[PDB]
Amino acid sequence: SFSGYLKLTDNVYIKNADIVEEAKKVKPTVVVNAANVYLKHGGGVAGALNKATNNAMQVESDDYIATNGPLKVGGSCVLSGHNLAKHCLHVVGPNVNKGEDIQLLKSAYENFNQHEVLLAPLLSAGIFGADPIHSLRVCVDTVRTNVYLAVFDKNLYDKLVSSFL
Numbered sequence: 001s002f003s004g005y006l007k008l009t010d011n012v013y014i015k016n017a018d019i020v021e022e023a024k025k026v027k028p029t030v031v032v033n034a035a036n037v038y039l040k041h042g043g044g045v046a047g048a049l050n051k052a053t054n055n056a057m058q059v060e061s062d063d064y065i066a067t068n069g070p071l072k073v074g075g076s077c078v079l080s081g082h083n084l085a086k087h088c089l090h091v092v093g094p095n096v097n098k099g100e101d102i103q104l105l106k107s108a109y110e111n112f113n114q115h116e117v118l119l120a121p122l123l124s125a126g127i128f129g130a131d132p133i134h135s136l137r138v139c140v141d142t143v144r145t146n147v148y149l150a151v152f153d154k155n156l157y158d159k160l161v162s163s164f165l
């Protein structure tokens with residue numbers, strides 16, 4: 001189903017794409033959201049995915065938090081993918097801008113191993129403040145399932161590919 005990806009490893013693929021447009025096109029089994037512990041989808045990938053669901057993701061998420069409380073940094077939950085995917089795997093990477101431990105990025109990527117194939121952003125990149133080059137490295141060294149990474153920024157995509165070891 002996924003097209004135009006560059007193969008980085010046996011199981012990691014990358015594309016310069018808007019993950020919302022990619023999800024609407026592919027309708028993958030799992031789209032990963034760059035979530036926070038409260039599932040407050042305000043900005044970045046979460047804000048964009050939520051806006052694409054006409055706020056249905058946020059309504060569902062508020063019910064999930066009311067029942068279960070917040071997620072842990074490094075944790076995840078599976079909720080509906082709405083009009084974007086069969087499921088959305090909300091994964092909380094550490095937010096460096098809130099002083100969270102970058103070592104939790106590996107724990108965050110381990111959630112991907114519970115799903116055979118996923119469309120995902122780089123965890124903790126963007127407004128979460130971590131180095132995206134380091135996020136890709138942790139992704140490659142942690143995820144064993146098939147992960148299709150969508151990198152929004154062209155300049156960052158080129159830098160990630162050209163510096164990939």
Ligand SMILES: C[C@H](NC(=O)C1CCCC1)C(=O)O
Nearest residue numbers: 125126132150151152153156
């Ligand atoms: C989230 C990621 N962007 C970044 O980490 C940089 C922050 C500004 C643009 C590059 C991306 O494009 O997928």
